[PDB]
Design a protein around this nucleic acid. Structure first.
Ligand code: MG
Ligand code: MG
Ligand code: MG
Ligand code: MG
Ligand code: MG
Ligand code: MG
Ligand code: MG
Ligand code: MG
Ligand code: MG
Ligand code: MG
Ligand code: MG
Ligand code: MG
Ligand code: MG
Ligand code: MG
Ligand code: MG
Ligand code: MG
Ligand code: MG
Ligand code: MG
Ligand code: MG
Ligand code: MG
Ligand code: MG
Ligand code: NA
Ligand code: NA
Ligand code: NA
Lengths: 130, 71, 61, 183, 141
RNA sequence: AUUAGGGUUCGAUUCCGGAGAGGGAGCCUGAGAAAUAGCUACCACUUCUACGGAGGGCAGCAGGCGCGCAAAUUGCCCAAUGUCAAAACAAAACGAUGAGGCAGCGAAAAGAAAUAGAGUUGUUGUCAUUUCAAUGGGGGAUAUUUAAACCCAUCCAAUAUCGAGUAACAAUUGGAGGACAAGUCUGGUGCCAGCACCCGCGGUAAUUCCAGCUCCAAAAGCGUAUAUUAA
């Protein structure tokens, strides 16, 4: 029978590995949300994982690739915990850093860059870059 | 092989007769190949004799073998 | 002369136009198979010695 | 281009399209097991033909042949685990005697009806398609799900379904929303 | 009777090669005479232009006027006679119309009581003739 | 691909090897080319011009014109996979890449699967009623996915989230003499129209044409043509 309850999230970690080469810890994160209404936001999982592993700043946790299990109530993804925020901003891919807010601005369209390069093949000296 | 012709100077033709199997008919057919072999002036083979030949570098357009023994 | 290209389509245009009557929809998919299975094997008891006709027609002429 | 994902067919049509003996037999299976079309029967026919083909090849080899020893034990383990055969029937000859209803009985559609979760074989199919049936706490929506003997006892109503521990269904949800909004 | 020798494979190979030509079906596939005479040139279909509407009498013991058209194929400018199926479908075909032609089902053999017709009209003005017959589509222009 | 076995047949096409860059022939550079988004010439075509001249090579991607029975977007991205390179990443500080990947188009082919399920009463089964629950298609989102999007997957409160009754959210494609599953049915045409792969049907009571009704077969598929394998 139904039982109205607060929706609770349980974080599960598997295949935990520590690599000092990139100054981080790698693991598979499994999320159990029996009564959740929808999908668990990645921000919420980051906060729970930070508290679970006792990291100083939750901004040094990186999560991606979360796949909801068929039938609901579960989700699995990948997580990285960095030694410090400096290491995260140095080794994380740009697209993942953009999801967290501190990412580089997008470059101009590749088409426009291609036109400029091809136009410069005509010019010889100091005309490139005008 | 078996010596087939001895009309070239220092060169002979040998025959390698063999049976080739046709899978569909489960039977054999007689086949042969002809090779030009250089013969050193130390063997003097005759037509019908059987020889042992060994591979060497190309010595002419068609010669790739040298006579090593005469039986 | 040797035949006529005219008269082509004569019967189709001659045939009186009878409108196709409206009927309630039939079940589709598994329900239709269940509906057919009921008539063939559950709606009647098979009497041996006489064959079963699935489209027996009323007598006429 | 440059894609290497394999795919293959799982059924074959009968050679004679209109045989009254086969048509009546297949119609009986369709209505008894609640099948949607004849392709479901022919899919089972292809499966049965594969196993019998392997069994016939193995029986040709001597009993001590390693292929017969290894591959022979593998197929019987498959038959016993999925319930096609019985544990007492532990010989390769009994694989040759398997029939189409034997595989059809192990379908989730038949198992749900036989277990009593549904009052009809057609009730079972719609229940499975409506995410009301869970095998080992996993929602299964495939009627052609072949149930293992080990997981037979774990078939029950889904946790998220209104028939188990889930919330109310559709007609109740809209009515309460209609009841509230009508004020 | 036949040779049975263990070392007689050459004779058996030669025998089959010579005798395969006696099979009319095998010879037709391995000879270009049929394709050279085939108006379609080995294709399943061919587009063409209607030259005229003609009436072909059915063979004895049938008695009818099978409605056909004379078609000049675009690919090779070859003239063929193609049957127009169904009732009244000849009215859907006009002079100098673009028609898709198909075989009659017996691979270049004449079909039915029509004396020597092995092609049939399948499309006219880029719309299916049978679709026009069932009023599923309308003829453009 | 098809095949009890033996065989028959296809292999332009993803990987390996070869060959070519409109046609031919030469050649420089270089470790490696007889290179062609390198050069030279000729033959075919062809573009610009102020008429002196100067150019061009999609059998790369996309896209045009033709050709035909016949085959998509002048899209997004270097996130992945790799290549090149003076090159880890990061820090004023982001290498290129139509190779490749991702979407659009796409009933080639392949897998899973809806179009309903339980009853009540009236008339063992059907039918007229009559309720009852369920669920997607779809519409949406704290969001998830993704390089970014789009598809899946999750959800319709966790305090708080849209929705089937003609469930109109309405299944088709071919057939009903024989081969070959299914009508002595009812109208209409009279060897005419037409059907018919073959045998045949139609010349006034058509089991075969044109139709309505009913029924059969396969079913989100189903006919037809041409090849090909079995038969
Ligand atoms: Mg649900
Ligand atoms: Mg004799
Ligand atoms: Mg065979
Ligand atoms: Mg090839
Ligand atoms: Mg070619
Ligand atoms: Mg080359
Ligand atoms: Mg070209
Ligand atoms: Mg170099
Ligand atoms: Mg060159
Ligand atoms: Mg080029
Ligand atoms: Mg050139
Ligand atoms: Mg196509
Ligand atoms: Mg890259
Ligand atoms: Mg690309
Ligand atoms: Mg490409
Ligand atoms: Mg499909
Ligand atoms: Mg529908
Ligand atoms: Mg996708
Ligand atoms: Mg019959
Ligand atoms: Mg009459
Ligand atoms: Mg009549
Ligand atoms: Na192109
Ligand atoms: Na694609
Ligand atoms: Na009829």
């Amino acid at each position: 029978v139904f039982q109205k309850k607060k929706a609770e999230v349980c974080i599960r970690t598997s295949q935990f590995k520590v690599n000092k080469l990139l100054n981080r810890k790698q693991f598979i994160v499994e999320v159990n949300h029996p009564h959740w209404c929808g999908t668990v936001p990645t921000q919420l999982i980051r906060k729970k994982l930070a508290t679970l592993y006792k990291v100083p700043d939750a901004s040094q946790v990186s999560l991606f690739g979360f796949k909801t299990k068929f039938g609901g109530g579960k989700t699995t993804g990948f997580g990285l915990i960095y030694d410090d925020l400096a290491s995260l901003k140095r080794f994380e891919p740009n697209y993942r850093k953009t999801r967290m807010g501190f990412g580089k601005a997008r470059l101009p369209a590749r088409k426009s860059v291609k036109e400029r390069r091809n136009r410069n093949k005509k010019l010889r000296g100091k005309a490139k870059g005008k | 092989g078996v010596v087939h012709s001895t009309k070239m100077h220092r060169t002979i033709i040998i025959r390698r007769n063999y049976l080739h199997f046709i899978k569909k008919y489960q039977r054999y057919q007689k086949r042969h190949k002809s090779l030009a072999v250089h013969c050193s002036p130390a063997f003097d083979p005759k037509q019908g004799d059987e020889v042992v030949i060994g591979q060497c570098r190309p010595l002419s357009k068609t010669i790739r073998y040298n006579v090593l023994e005469v039986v | 002369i040797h035949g006529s290209l005219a008269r082509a389509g004569k019967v189709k245009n001659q045939t009186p136009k009878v409108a196709k009557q409206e009927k309630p929809k039939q079940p589709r998919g598994r329900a239709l198979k269940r509906l057919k299975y009921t008539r063939r094997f559950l709606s009647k008891t098979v009497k041996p010695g006489e064959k079963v006709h699935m489209n027996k027609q009323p007598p006429g002429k | 281009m440059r894609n290497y994902n394999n795919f293959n067919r799982v059924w074959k049509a009968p050679r004679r399209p209109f045989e009254k003996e086969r048509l009546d037999r297949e119609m009986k299976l369709c209505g008894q097991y609640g099948l949607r079309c004849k392709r479901e029967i022919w899919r089972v026919n292809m499966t049965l033909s594969k196993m019998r083909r392997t069994a016939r090849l193995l029986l040709t080899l001597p009993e001590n042949h390693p292929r017969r020893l290894l591959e022979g034990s593998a197929i019987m383990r498959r038959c016993h685990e999925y319930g096609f055969l019985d544990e007492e029937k532990d010989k390769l000859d009994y694989v040759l005697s398997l029939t189409v209803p034997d595989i059809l009985e192990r379908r989730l559609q038949t198992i749900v009806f036989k277990a009593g979760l549904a009052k009809s074989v057609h009730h079972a199919r719609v229940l499975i398609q409506q995410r009301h049936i869970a095998v080992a706490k996993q929602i299964v929506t495939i009627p052609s799900f072949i149930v293992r003997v080990s997981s037979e006892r774990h078939i029950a109503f889904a946790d998220a379904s209104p028939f188990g521990n889930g919330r109310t269904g559709r007609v109740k949800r809209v009515r309460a929303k209609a009841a509230k909004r009508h004020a | 009777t036949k040779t049975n020798g263990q070392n007689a494979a050459r004779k058996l190979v030669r025998l089959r090669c010579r005798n395969r030509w006696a099979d009319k079906g095998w010879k037709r596939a391995h000879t270009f005479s049929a394709r050279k005479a085939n108006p379609f040139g080995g294709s399943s279909h061919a587009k063409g232009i209607v030259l005229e509407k003609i009436g072909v009498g059915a063979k004895q013991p049938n008695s009818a006027i099978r409605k056909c058209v004379r078609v000049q194929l675009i690919k090779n400018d070859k003239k063929i006679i193609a049957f127009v199926p169904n009732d009244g479908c000849l009215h859907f075909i006009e002079e100098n119309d673009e028609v898709l032609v198909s075989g009659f089902g017996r691979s270049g053999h004449a079909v039915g009581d029509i004396p020597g017709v092995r092609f049939k009209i399948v499309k006219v003005s880029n719309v299916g003739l049978y679709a026009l017959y069932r009023q599923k589509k309308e003829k453009p222009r």
